[PDB]
Ligand binder design. Structure first.
Ligand SMILES: Nc1nc2c(ncn2[C@@H]2O[C@H](COP(=O)(O)OP(=O)(O)OP(=O)(O)O)[C@@H](O)[C@H]2O)c(=O)[nH]1
Lengths: 285, 275, 166, 33, 300, 135, 246
RNA sequence: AUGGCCAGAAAGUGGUGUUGACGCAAUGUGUCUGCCCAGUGCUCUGAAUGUCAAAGUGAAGAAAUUCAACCAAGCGCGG
């Protein structure tokens, strides 16, 4: 029992295990002694607590690992949800150190956006998983109880699999709706997620030929600021040809200078001019 | 980085601390003027050092050392520093030269591995040469045991105070830097991280061609006179004009005073903006 | 059970001698050296000290052992390295006076002094691994062979030292 | 002998509607069967 | 790996007009995976033969291929056959590329049982006064190992002159020098010539008749005695070092020195240096009764 | 010393408690969640609100796992609600963004993405040092 | 010589000032302490101008230049531009540049002979910099920081860089620059060298929280306070830096 | 033990450690031994040719080249 602040779970065990069993409970706060229960004043996030729990387990393994804990709650519920998720993962890492093949591990997990990321850990580390939410838990509460059993017992476990950084790392950004940004640029689409890494200064330019040759013209229009006609350091003959064409009028050059102020008609005109130039240049279609 | 001053009463421990630091340690001619630990601070080679003045230790075993001198012993045992054992070649301290030797030998176990210096104070009264050869050997053979150095100083005329201070401070710095390098260098040969970062700060990059760059320093600064606030004939300065002409929030700055135009009368002109 | 630790530093042991009685010896898992359950007498209070030593080879239960500087130089007593003379086997010796024994606790090792240094008192002690060390004379040590035996199966040969050997 | 399966983690986390839709389409195909 | 090892084995069997036809042939086959070949003992027995029978261009290209991990070759238990054969043929560039990475890890390499003997023969055979010096400087303290020596003319490895320049380093350097020497003494590894050089500059710099001098002479005495005194007299610096030890030693020490000196009077007499220590021992010894009982009956 | 800036002029506050703003630094955080505003008054039912250059207390909702462990101070850098500067200019940005800053005023990151509001740059020299565009 | 001062109560001297070999720009605010510390060290050898840039007092991070030129962002007003021109002699060229990265002080570090710029700078801005400032322009990152103007202090004597700059990058920068470079801190461990110090060929002003070991390094690499201070004295005596920055 | 190993950016952070060279760790093994082949490349070593000295006396040395299946060694080894 990795967290028994009052000791209720230890008391429940002390009255239903088979005779001559072993139950050990650790907690940061002092616990009033319960008969047939071993009580620890040590913490859980310290490898000293690892050694002393080795000491009172002898060479024997462990069959069931219990975790029922929650940090201080009252700060926006975002800090509260994440800290509980990390505590669940650290309890899981402790269980992998002390549990026999086929053991059962049960954890209280607050339901949040990290709930699915922790469930994937027991999936790759155990054989059967399930969330229960017994009736005693308040219906208003977001708490849930996950039981993952059938522990595979590998020879060595990847530290990245137990590292909170690698499990709770946020997934990749989904592909932006370039069609919406081009075909409906007058919509608001409020941005609240952060900016990407590496595209600081929030500015990007390409050459006009790149817009001509690309397979995804919508992607370039919706993600770039300026389509440049500046002759490259070497000197592009296609830029010379595309600049001198009569299809590219003054209106075309105006739109290419400022892509972020364009509308529906302007974007369609750019796509039409791209198709006309591609026909001149002999591109497939 | 600490300098620890110990010795018999009335040898000049408090006078030495007052000389190098600004700690207000009483200096009086009686036996136990300093009844508690005093701390001073000095700067040497752009580093901060502590100087601790101790009450004083008599020639007794540790069992019946009273409360005052146990403050001396506790600092001697549990503080790693350079010990400055102040001796009295004369007998003005009220204790024999013999009793000072035995006291040093008795407390040497407390100096188990520290840097021990024996400084002979109050030598404006009677210096080393005016000693019988048997005593000179007894002082000398103390150095001829372990790593103890003997220095000579006088805290009344301030004759050997600075040289003793610099000598001890330099030796403390060398040993400490040696220890830091040793800790960074592990047994496997892998240089530690903190050592690696301090390597880059020592290193000075230099252009490979060995050519310098032209420096445009005017001739005027070469003949400038350093500004000093105690000089009656100093520069006027803008803050002094500010104080005489009001305060921080009352003085109004004339921003056109330093305008260099063609016709000086054109300053303080309302330049047209819109027509 | 309990770690094998010496008595705390005190005036009585460092200047006199104290009588103590052993009651039994207990084996504990994790090591082969048998612990010795001993009861001492407090010079200041009418209370018995419960401390555990390591049973050397040859001792029994029921000695009036002497703990101090001037104790009898017999097996079962402890003595500062200053008092014990040259060539004597010592076990469970102290690196410094106050660590309650650090060197030579496994089942059968011993340390023999090969020279005493009077002025600036230091005692030279040979380690079981064949190393040479110098320790303060004020340290204590258990006299005799620590129990456990089994010293006929120790292979002492090195690839490099053999090339070093003449 | 298990390691960090990066691609599997993305598949597990991103696909929840697709696995649900697969189950409903299978139950329907059972039912019509 | 199976076919690679198999085919090179046949080339190794042929080699252990036809000769150089193989060394290009084996090189092209072994081009790229040298680190694995120096790991395999059979391929280890292939390479030093190859370098011995290597054409002028081959030993350079393999050296650049071996550029990265010269130190790791020293720690490898099987690369001794190849690394010894790489050092014994004299060439000015190959001794200029072998030492720079050996530099700055002297303490670790000597502590390593197998590289310690490899670290000696490079020092004894081909090392020139510059790289010989700073390996000794690395022995004096960790400051010298990590830091490239300053613009001062004292770039040598003599304690007397470097400590004269900077007296404040007397205490730490001696402690480091004593600890490293004492650890190897307790390791019983005392057949290192560069160890004897460190011992000499240590004893020379001690003030006479000091307590630490008594500690050094006694700890030198304390051993089984059948090894350390014999090779230390065999070497150059130790032979003079032990001459001073007799001069500064006490009679009880001198009794122990000659008592350890036993049953090898034939061999050390034939050695060039160890008949200088008996040379000094003859005219500094006082106890003639033991002189006539030990050194003469085993001599005449 | 509470991190309430001094010398700040009155502007329209447009980020009340319980608002999400982007993160403009390279510290690993993407968005911040305002839960407290430094220097807020005490009036009934009024939600504390911040502005450009105002220290707030925020929690990282999405970003690097380390930054999600503790509540951080932050200085608002850009604001979508139009406000007026003393030169008579009503101006606004296209998003709400801030930077994680220690209680003294030192930025945790080393670079800022996007422009920095003039009020925030003038108030905090460290943000002014790590800014590329000031407008 | 190296001196310590604070603008109002902050040690970021580089934010509120700009020091060259021909002119000094000081922010305008409240008292006259910041102006007086600079004119106590520059007694009318070179002009000192009390200026504001774009209605701000952070002129240090908004302006860049050497003795031959000065550059200001596009948000600078005409009156603010006139104040600079009337204050400075005709041998210095002042140009207002229309660049997206308006914090010129953070994106340009320039001595008299060379300049380092933000990699994402415009090509037209690069051409103007080489013209007005009369230097050779290079695009570089200081310890993977694109704000070269804030993480490096430069003069014709030497240069400070970000404290965590690796050994190899110092060698490339020094050969590219032509002056010796050391990795150092300012204002008791701050990494923003440009924002926490200004320096020319004969004077540096840092914050009041700069430690004595740091001030010694600044003098040694910038050749100030007479003495010797070549930068080889930094390798000569090394116990303080190892003791203080370990 | 001012120690080794492991974690930790570091730590005056810890664990091992309630530990003291049998203890604590880390690398390799789970091909060993016996025999046979007109088996194998070499090192040491050995041979030959042509030279110039040789403490106011002792050793006879070195230079340059061609070389060596078996004819008392060794490093390796391969089937
Ligand atoms: N002549 C001479 N007298 C000294 C010198 N240094 C200290 N004294 C004398 O020492 C007396 C005071 O003793 P302290 O200097 O304070 O020595 P202490 O170790 O602190 O012992 P206390 O006397 O108890 O304070 C003064 O009256 C001085 O006369 C010195 O350098 N020369």
């Amino acid at each position: 029992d990795l967290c028994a602040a009052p000791g209720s779970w230890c008391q429940v065990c002390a009255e239903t295990m088979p005779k001559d069993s072993l139950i050990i409970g650790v907690d940061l706060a002092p616990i009033k002694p319960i008969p047939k229960v071993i009580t620890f004043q040590s913490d859980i996030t310290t490898e000293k607590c690892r050694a002393t729990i080795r000491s009172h387990l002898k060479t024997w393994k462990a069959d069931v690992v219990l975790h029922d804990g929650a940090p201080n709650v009252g700060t926006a519920w975002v800090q509260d949800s994440y800290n509980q998720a990390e505590l669940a993962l650290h309890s899981l890492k402790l269980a992998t150190e002390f549990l026999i093949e086929g053991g059962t591990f049960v954890t209280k997990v607050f339901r949040s956006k990290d709930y699915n990321k922790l469930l994937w850990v027991c999936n790759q580390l155990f054989t059967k998983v399930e969330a229960t939410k017994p009736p005693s838990s308040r219906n208003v509460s977001a708490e849930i109880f996950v039981v993952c059993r059938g522990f595979k017992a590998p020879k060595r476990i990847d530290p990245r699999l137990l590292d909170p950084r690698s499990i709770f790392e946020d997934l990749a950004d989904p592909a932006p709706n370039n069609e919406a940004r081009v075909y409906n640029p007058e919509q608001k689409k409020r941005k609240r997620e952060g900016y990407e890494e590496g595209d600081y200064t929030q500015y990007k330019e390409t050459s006009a030929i790149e817009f001509i040759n690309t397979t995804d013209p919508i992607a370039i229009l919706a993600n770039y600021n300026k389509l440049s006609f500046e002759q490259p350091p070497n000197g592009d003959v296609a830029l010379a040809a595309l600049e001198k064409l009569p299809e590219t009028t003054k209106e075309i050059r105006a739109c290419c200078d400022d892509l972020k102020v364009l509308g529906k008609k302007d974007f369609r005109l750019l796509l039409k001019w791209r198709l006309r130039v591609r026909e001149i240049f002999g591109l497939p279609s | 980085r600490t300098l620890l001053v110990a010795g018999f009463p009335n040898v000049g421990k408090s006078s030495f601390v007052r000389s190098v630091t600004r700690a207000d340690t009483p200096v009086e001619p009686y036996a136990f003027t300093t009844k508690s630990l005093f701390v001073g601070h000095l700067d040497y080679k752009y580093l901060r050092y502590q100087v601790i003045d101790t009450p004083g230790i008599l020639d007794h075993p540790l069992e019946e050392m009273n409360t005052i001198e146990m403050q001396s012993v506790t600092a001697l045992a549990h503080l790693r520093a350079a010990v400055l054992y102040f001796m009295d070649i004369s007998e003005q301290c009220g204790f024999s030269l013999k009793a000072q030797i035995n006291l040093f030998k008795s407390i040497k176990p407390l100096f188990a591995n520290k840097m021990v210096f024996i400084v002979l104070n109050k030598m404006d009264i009677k210096k080393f040469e005016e000693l019988d050869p048997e005593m000179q050997q007894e002082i000398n053979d103390l150095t001829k045991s372990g790593e103890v150095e003997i220095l000579r100083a006088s805290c009344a005329t301030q004759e050997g105070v600075q040289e003793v201070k610099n000598h001890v401070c330099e030796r403390l710095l060398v040993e400490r830097v040696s220890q830091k390098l040793k800790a960074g260098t592990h047994s496997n040969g892998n240089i530690g991280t903190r050592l690696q970062e301090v390597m880059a700060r020592i290193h000075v990059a230099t252009p490979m061609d060995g050519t310098t760059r032209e420096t445009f320093i005017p001739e005027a600064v070469k003949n400038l006179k350093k500004y000093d606030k105690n000089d009656p004939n100093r520069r006027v300065l803008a803050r002094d004009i500010e104080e005489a002409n009001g305060g921080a929030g009352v003085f109004n700055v004339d921003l056109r005073k330093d305008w260099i135009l063609e016709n000086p009368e054109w300053k303080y002109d309302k330049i047209p903006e819109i027509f | 059970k309990a770690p094998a630790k010496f008595r705390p530093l005190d005036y009585a042991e460092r200047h006199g001698y104290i009588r103590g009685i052993v009651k039994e010896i207990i084996h504990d898992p994790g090591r082969g050296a048998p612990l010795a359950r001993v009861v001492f007498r407090s010079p200041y209070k009418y209370k018995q000290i419960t401390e555990t030593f390591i049973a050397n080879e040859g001792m029994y239960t029921g000695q009036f052992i002497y703990a101090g500087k001037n104790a009898a130089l017999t097996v079962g007593n402890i003595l500062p390295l200053s008092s014990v003379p040259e060539g004597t086997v010592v076990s469970n010796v102290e690196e410094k006076p106050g660590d309650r024994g650090a060197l030579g606790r496994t089942s059968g090792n011993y340390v023999t002094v090969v020279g005493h240094n009077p002025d600036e008192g230091k005692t030279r002690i040979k380690l079981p691994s064949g190393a040479k060390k110098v320790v303060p004379s004020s340290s204590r040590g258990m006299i005799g062979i620590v129990a456990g035996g089994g010293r006929t199966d120790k292979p002492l040969l090195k690839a490099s030292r053999a090339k070093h050997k003449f | 002998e298990i390691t960090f399966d990066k691609e599997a983690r993305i598949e597990y986390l991103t696909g929840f509607r697709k696995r649900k839709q697969a189950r409903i389409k299978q139950a329907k195909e059972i039912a019509e069967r | 790996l199976a076919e690679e090892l198999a085919r090179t084995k046949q080339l190794w069997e042929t080699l252990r007009e036809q000769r150089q036809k193989l060394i290009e042939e084996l090189y092209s086959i072994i081009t790229g995976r040298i680190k694995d070949f120096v790991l395999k003992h059979d391929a280890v027995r292939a390479v030093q033969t190859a370098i011995k029978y290597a054409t002028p261009t081959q030993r350079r290209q393999i050296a650049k291929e071996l550029q990265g991990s010269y130190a790791q070759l020293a720690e490898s238990r099987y690369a001794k056959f190849l690394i010894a054969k790489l050092l014994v043929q004299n060439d000015e560039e190959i001794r200029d590329m072998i030492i720079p990475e050996f530099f700055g890890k002297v303490r670790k390499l000597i502590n390593h049982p197998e590289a310690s003997w490899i670290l000696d023969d490079i020092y004894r055979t081909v090392a020139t006064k510059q790289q010989k010096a700073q390996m000794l400087r690395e022995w004096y303290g960790p400051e010298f190992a990590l830091f490239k020596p300053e613009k001062g003319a004292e770039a040598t490895a003599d304690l007397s002159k470097i400590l004269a320049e900077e007296p404040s380093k007397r205490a730490p350097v001696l402690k480091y020098l004593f600890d490293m020497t004492n650890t190897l003494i307790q390791k019983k590894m005392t057949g290192f010539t560069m160890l004897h050089d460190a011992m000499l500059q240590y004893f020379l710099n001690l003030k006479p008749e000091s307590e630490e001098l008594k500690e050094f002479v006694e700890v030198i005495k304390g051993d089984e005695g059948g090894d350390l005194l014999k090779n230390l007299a065999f070497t150059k610096s130790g032979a003079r070092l032990v001459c001073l030890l007799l001069a500064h030693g006490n009679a009880k020490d001198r009794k122990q020195i000659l008592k350890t000196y036993k049953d090898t009077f034939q061999l050390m007499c034939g050695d060039q240096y160890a008949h200088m220590v008996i040379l000094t021992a003859y005219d500094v010894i006082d106890d003639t009764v033991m002189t006539a009982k030990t050194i003469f009956p085993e001599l005449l | 010393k509470r991190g309430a800036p001094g010398g700040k002029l009155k502007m329209t506050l447009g980020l009340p408690v319980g608002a999400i703003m982007n993160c403009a630094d390279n510290s690993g955080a993407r968005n911040l969640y305002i839960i407290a505003v430094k220097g807020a008054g005490a009036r009934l039912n009024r939600l504390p609100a911040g502005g450009v250059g105002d220290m707030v207390m925020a929690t990282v909702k999405k970003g690097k796992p380390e930054l999600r462990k503790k509540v951080h101070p932050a200085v608002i850098v850009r604001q979508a609600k139009p406000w007026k500067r003393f030169d008579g200019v009503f101006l606004y940005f296209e998003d709400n963004a801030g930077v994680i800053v220690n209680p003294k005023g030192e930025m945790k990151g080393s670079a800022i993405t996007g422009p920095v509001g003039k009020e925030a740059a003038e108030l905090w020299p460290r943000i002014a040092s790590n800014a590329g565009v000031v407008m | 010589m190296a001196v310590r001062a604070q603008f109002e109560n902050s040690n970021e001297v580089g934010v509120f000032a700009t020091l060259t070999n021909s002119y000094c720009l000081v922010a305008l605010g409240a008292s006259e302490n910041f102006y007086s510390v600079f004119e106590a060290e520059l007694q009318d050898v070179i002009p000192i101008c009390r200026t504001t840039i774009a209605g701000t007092r952070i002129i240090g991070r908004l302006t860049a230049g050497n003795r031959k030129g000065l550059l200001v962002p596009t948000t600078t007003t005409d009156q603010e531009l006139q104040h600079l021109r009337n204050s400075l002699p005709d041998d210095i060229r002042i140009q207002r540049i229309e660049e997206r990265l308006s914090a010129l002080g953070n994106v340009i570090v320039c001595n008299d002979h060379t300049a380092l710029i933000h990699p994402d700078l415009e090509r037209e801005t690069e051409e103007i910099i080489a013209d007005v400032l009369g230097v050779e322009v290079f695009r570089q990152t200081i310890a993977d920081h694109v704000l070269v103007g804030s993480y490096m202090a430069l003069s014709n004597q030497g240069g400070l860089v970000h404290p965590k700059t690796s050994i190899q990058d110092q060698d490339e920068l020094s050969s590219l620059l032509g002056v010796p470079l050391v990795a150092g801190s300012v204002n008791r461990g701050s990494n923003v060298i440009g924002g926490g110090m200004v320096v020319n060929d004969w004077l540096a002003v840092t914050g009041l929280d700069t430690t004595a070991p740091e001030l010694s390094v600044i003098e040694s690499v910038f050749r100030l306070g007479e003495g010797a201070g070549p930068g080889a004295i930094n390798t000569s005596m090394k116990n303080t830096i190892v003791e203080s920055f370990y």
